[PDB]
């Protein structure tokens, strides 16, 4: 197990434009196209992110290219942010994948807001961090996936992603 196979589980794979949980036009392995209501503006972004005329459908190879750019972008977003780089530094290879999984979902800004949770994780107060991380929209709006990530933080293992 690794960060790639981990996010591929939470995100899935659909090759035609779809609406993510929140209702936003999405494609591939959880690649948010836009927060606009207009489908024609979703298509536009897609064409611009792939470099051709798509019409709302892409191939598996393309879907995985955005996935690689997206995972790369989530790591670089952490190592540039004054509140995320120290924490990421203090974590093991499993708890680093979890912190990425968050950034990938809700963005660097959204994670960097979790001030009190970040501190706990930095103090290696795991059980306490797990309880704090659950008092959030992230947990109510997408509870199953969140309690997979929270379990990773609490345990430092792959147990939540292994029986799948």
- Positions touching Cl ion (CB under 5 A) are 135, 142, 144-145
Closest distance to Cl ion from the beta carbon of 150 (Å): 12
Q: Decide whether 95 or 145 has the Cβ nearer to Cl ion.
A: 145
Q: Decide whether 86 or 143 has the Cβ nearer to Cl ion.
A: 143
Work out the number of other CB atoms within 10 angstroms of the CB of residue 43.
19
Q: Which residue is nearest to Cl ion (CB)?
A: 144
Closest distance to Cl ion from the beta carbon of 52 (Å): 33
Task: DSSP for 10-38, please give it.
Answer: HH--EEEEEE-TTS-EEEETTEE--S-S-
Is residue 57 helix, strand or coil?
strand
Contact between 135 and 143 under an 8 Å Cβ cutoff? The reply is: no
Closest distance to Cl ion from the beta carbon of 22 (Å): 12
Work out the number of other CB atoms within 10 angstroms of the CB of residue 53.
8
Q: Which residues are catalytic?
A: 11, 20
């Amino acid at each position: 197990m690794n960060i790639f196979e981990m996010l591929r589980i939470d995100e899935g794979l659909r090759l035609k434009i779809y609406k993510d949980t929140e209702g936003y036009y999405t494609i591939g392995i959880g690649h948010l196209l836009t927060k606009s209501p207009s489908l024609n503006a979703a298509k536009s972004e897609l064409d611009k992110a792939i470099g051709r005329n798509t019409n709302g459908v892409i191939t598996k190879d393309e879907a995985e290219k955005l996935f690689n750019q997206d995972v790369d972008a989530a790591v670089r977003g952490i190592l540039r942010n004054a509140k995320l780089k120290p924490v990421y530094d203090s974590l093991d290879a499993v708890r680093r994948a979890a912190l990425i999984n968050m950034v990938f979902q809700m963005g660097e800004t959204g994670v960097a807001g979790f001030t009190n949770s970040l501190r706990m994780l930095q103090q290696k107060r795991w059980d306490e961090a797990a309880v704090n991380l659950a008092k959030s929209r992230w947990y109510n709006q997408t509870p199953n996936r969140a309690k997979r990530v929270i379990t990773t933080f609490r345990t430092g293992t792959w147990d939540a992603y292994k029986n799948l």
